[PDB]
Structure formats: structure tokens, C-alpha cells
Amino acid sequence: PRLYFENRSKFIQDQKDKGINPYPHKFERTISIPEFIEKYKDLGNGEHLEDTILNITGRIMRVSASGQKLRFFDLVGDGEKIQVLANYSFHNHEKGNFAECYDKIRRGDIVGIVGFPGKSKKGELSIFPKETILLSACLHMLPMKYGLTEIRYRQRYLDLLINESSRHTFVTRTKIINFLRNFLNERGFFEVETPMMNLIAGNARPFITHHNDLDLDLYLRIATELPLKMLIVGGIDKVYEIGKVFRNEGIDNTHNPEFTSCEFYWAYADYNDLIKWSEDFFSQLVYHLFGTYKISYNKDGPENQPIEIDFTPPYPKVSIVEEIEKVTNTILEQPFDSNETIEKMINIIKEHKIELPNPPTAAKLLDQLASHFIENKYNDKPFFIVEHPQIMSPLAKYHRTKPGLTERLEMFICGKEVLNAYTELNDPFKQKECFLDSAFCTSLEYGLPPTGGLGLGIDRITMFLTNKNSIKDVILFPTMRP
């Protein structure tokens, strides 16, 4: 209970009163635990190198029987575990009594060990201490290795120490990001940094904050799209950024207020080049992590059967306007925001009984029509939704053959959007929103070269590559209410 904390807290006072520093300043580690393994993992059983004295650190995760001559411990560090065999014969009695300097070590304590490598006669690789010091004691009681359950979200430090699956989840998350950064850097791109506080944000509700020195409300950025396109006008033909974006929307299993995004912009490249980029990226991404393009994902949870997602390119391409016109057997007349087609789309929303968006705009009705009849159609492999109407794509260049549409693409995994790209609209006259930042509109008048931009959802991508059902499991500290 709280009793264990009260006992360990006053033990720290005892050692302080006995002239011992329970939190010493420096302990010179001469080898880490993973490095300890590789250097001595092929030693014989019972073979001791008693004449190679190491200095090792780590956390105690298991204390064994208190045999008054042999002590067994578990030293875990950097995600890997070794054994500690404290023998009275090998212990240095010059610094303290053997039984006295080991009965005080509880499970969870950070210790510093001076010893030599070797293997047990059983066959377990162990470090044999001649000297053991407490570096940082654990006042509370650590849970068992299967005791975590939303504590993993608030006390993430416990979740990283107890559940082995949690570390792997984040060792691969930053590997997905590092692979993405190298993928663009090796193709001649340019990582930059665009501001997060502006005067207008540019489908999102804005986080409003106030600057006290300037006395003006600033919108937290919802997308790094506009300032990156302004950098394309500036000459930076291949630019990207990987940072946090903000949505003041709802919180559920696949949405978070802040979330990691990546947007690159490619000069003189178009919609066809963006499809090839995503096919090359995701295929090599999952092959870099797994040695294969087919991955297993549990859409229904770990208790149920998983599905197989094949990442072998190419991926299916599906036009949104056509399949909405097929699965519903309807014909939508352009313009889609006419008072007749708007009513016709609402009629389909009420027949098939779907949550009608609020308010009923032709863009939201088309998006809602695609979210039910198209998105959750193909789950065993990623696919693109292509050629969105310009009523749904204000900054996407008009389609070069079919009127009313654009050259847009959205890739989905298990029916969730993880990618958004299109050929960038560069005509300032065809951009009617410019009669949006007025600084962006002015930058279009200075000449935006034919550009293709693409946006990636880092958190959702990491979810499906780690077999996770909730976005709270790919973020170290998800924002919640105390």
C-alpha cells in the first residue's frame, strides 16, 4: 500500500543518518548491459573471467532468495536484462558486511556494480559483484511484468519498465521517423521549420492562444501546408518538415489534439510522381522494419483474429465520385453544391442511414458518402482514393482532363487516412479564396512552379506498423484529464 513507500522513504533517511549517500553523484560505467552481453555471450558454462573487472549499472527487477552466501538479482538496462550473482567468496568485505549490503536492496533500485563477467554453472550469463552501491532507490513498489489498465498513459515510465512491448513500440516509432527523414534527405530534400502561431489557420477548429507582448490572438497551426508552398516560390524546390500540428477537435481512439505530421513539396513533379513516391516509401518502409511487405494487424483486438496487410506496390486507385455513383447507383450532377445534388446526396445519407454531417455541405456530404461506401471497402492492402472534386480540394490544382475534379490522392490503411497529396494549384486567378493567409495568396502571384506536395500522418502510420488499435499507444504522453 502506501505503507511500503513510508518504509522505503525512512530507509533513505537511515542511510543519510548513517553517513551514506543513497543518491551519489557519479558512478563511472565502463560497459552497458547490452554491451556486456555481446562481449561475453559466448562464454562457457561456469567460466569466470575473475581478472577483468567491469563497472556496470542498471535497475533491479528481481531479488531472489537470501541465502547467506549466494545472492541472485536481475539487472535490467537499455531494454535488456542480465543476472547478478553476489557470492560471499567474491565479495569485498572491506567496504561493508555482505549480508548488510544486500538485504537493503529492494526490487526497483538503481544500483552500481563493480564485478567481473562470467556464466553460471546452470548456463545464465551473470555479472559477479565484488562491490554493490545504491545509486537511486525506488521508494514505491514496481508492478509485476504483467500488471499493466490505463496507468500506461499517465505513468509511462512504469509502462516502459514493465511491459517489453512498450519499448519496442517506441523504438520502431522513431525508426519510422528516422527512415522518413533519410528517405527525403537521400532524395535531395531540405528540412526546415515553419511557425506554429499565425493569424489564420490553413477542415479544423483552431487552438486560440494570446501573445502578451503583441496583444493579438494567434491560431495554433493545423497544417504546415501554406508556408512550405511559400518556400517553393522562394527557390527551395525540395522542402519538407516533420513537426506537431494541432486540431481542436474530438479525442478518441484515432484522434489526438496534437499529432505528428510530415509534409514535403516537390517542384516540377505532379500527381503521378506522388503515387510512385508513396508506393516506393511504404513498401521500403515496411521492408526496412520487417524484411517483408506483408504485415499482421489486429483490427478487432489481440483476443480476436488479425488481418493481413500486403504492402507490395502498386496499390489500387479508386475515384471517389465514380464509386459513390456506383455503390449507391446514383448520378450526381455538377456542380455538386447545387440545391438538387445536395438534396440527392442527403437522400442517400438517409436511405443508407448515415450520420448526416453538420452543416450539410456538398464537401461534407461527399466526404461522408465516401467514408461509408469507399473507405472501409479494402483493408487487406493499402489503396488510394483519387480525383476529389475541387469543392473538397481548395488548394489542389484542377484536374487536367475531367472537369470539376482535381489531381488529389488519399492513401488508406484499414479504412483510416494516413496520407494526403495532390498537384499543387499554382494559378492565383483560379484560387477564388484569394479573391487563407493573404501572404500566401500574394506569394502565388510571384509565380509558384508546378509542384506536388504530400502529407503524412506519422501517428496513424506507426499505429498500423506496431499492431496498435489506439493512438494513445504510439504517443509517449497523450493529453488527458487529471
Angle ∠(85,91,94) on CA atoms, nearest 5 = 155
Q: Where does residue 87 fall: left (phi above 0), alpha (psi -120 to 50 degrees), or beta otherwise?
A: beta
Among a second copy, ligand E5C, ligand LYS, none, partner that 198 touches (CB below 5 to 8 angstroms by kind): a second copy
Q: Is residue 388 part of the contact set for ligand E5C (CB under 6 A)?
A: no
H helices present in 330-376, as ranges? 341-351, 362-373
Residue corresponding to grid cell 503515387: 275
Would you tell me how many other CB atoms lie within 10 Å of the CB of residue 16? 12
Select 112 or 455, whichever has its Cβ closest to a second copy. Answer: 112
Residues 252-311 that bind ligand E5C (CB under 6 A): 255-256, 259, 261
Among ligand E5C, ligand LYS, a second copy, none, partner that 453 touches (CB below 5 to 8 angstroms by kind): ligand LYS
- Figure out which of the listed residues 109, 131, 159, 225 binds ligand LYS, where binding follows CB under 6 A: 225
Give the span between the Cα atoms of 73 and 87, in whole angstroms.
11
Q: Which stretch, 164-172, 309-317, 330-338, 377-385, contacts a second copy (CB under 8 A)?
A: 164-172
- State the angle between helix axes of 271-290 and 164-185 in degrees (0 to 180), rounded to the nearest 10: 140
Residue corresponding to grid cell 562457457: 44
Minimum separation from the CB atom of position 219 to ligand E5C (A)? 14
Select 17 or 215, whichever has its Cβ closest to ligand E5C. Answer: 215
Q: Which stretch, 25-33, 68-76, 319-327, 417-425, contacts ligand E5C (CB under 6 A)?
A: 417-425
Minimum separation from the CB atom of position 254 to ligand E5C (A)? 6
Q: What is the largest CA-CA distance in the chain?
A: 93
Find out whether 476 and 305 touch, Cβ atoms under 8 Å: no
Give the span between the Cα atoms of 245 and 393, in whole angstroms.
19
Residues 150-189 that bind ligand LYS (CB under 6 A): none
Q: Which stretch, 72-80, 86-94, 303-311, 413-421, contacts a second copy (CB under 8 A)?
A: 72-80
Q: Is residue 462 part of the contact set for ligand E5C (CB under 6 A)?
A: no
Minimum separation from the CB atom of position 259 to ligand E5C (A)? 4
Q: Is residue 223 part of the contact set for ligand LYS (CB under 6 A)?
A: yes
String of DSSP letters for 209-244:
EEETTTTEEEEEPS-SHHHHHHHHHTT-SEEEEEEE
Q: How far is CA 428 from CA 380, 391, 420, 477, in A?
A: 41, 17, 22, 42
Minimum separation from the CB atom of position 412 to ligand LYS (A)? 13
* Helices (H) then strands (E): counts for the chain: 13, 17
Among ligand E5C, ligand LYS, a second copy, none, partner that 41 touches (CB below 5 to 8 angstroms by kind): none
Residues 39-78 that bind ligand E5C (CB under 6 A): none
What is the length of the chain?
A: 482
- Figure out which of the listed residues 455, 462, 464, 472 binds ligand E5C, where binding follows CB under 6 A: 455
Q: Which stretch, 210-218, 354-362, 418-426, 436-444, contacts ligand E5C (CB under 6 A)?
A: 418-426
- Figure out which of the listed residues 85, 113, 161, 395 binds a second copy, where binding follows CB under 8 A: 161
**What per-residue string of b and e applies to 144-181 under the rule 16 or more CB within 10 Å gives b?**
eeeebeeebbeebebbbbbbeebeebbebbeebbebbe
Cis peptide, bond prior to residue 22, ω within 30 of zero: no
Residues 243-262 that bind ligand E5C (CB under 6 A): 245, 247, 249, 255-256, 259, 261
Q: Is residue 234 part of the contact set for a second copy (CB under 8 A)?
A: yes
Task: Tell me the three cell numbers of residue 321.
Answer: 465520385
Q: Which residues bind ligand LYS (CB under 6 A)?
A: 223, 225, 263, 420-422, 453-455
Q: Which residues bind ligand E5C (CB under 6 A)?
A: 204, 223, 245, 247, 249, 255-256, 259, 261, 417-420, 455-457, 459-460, 471
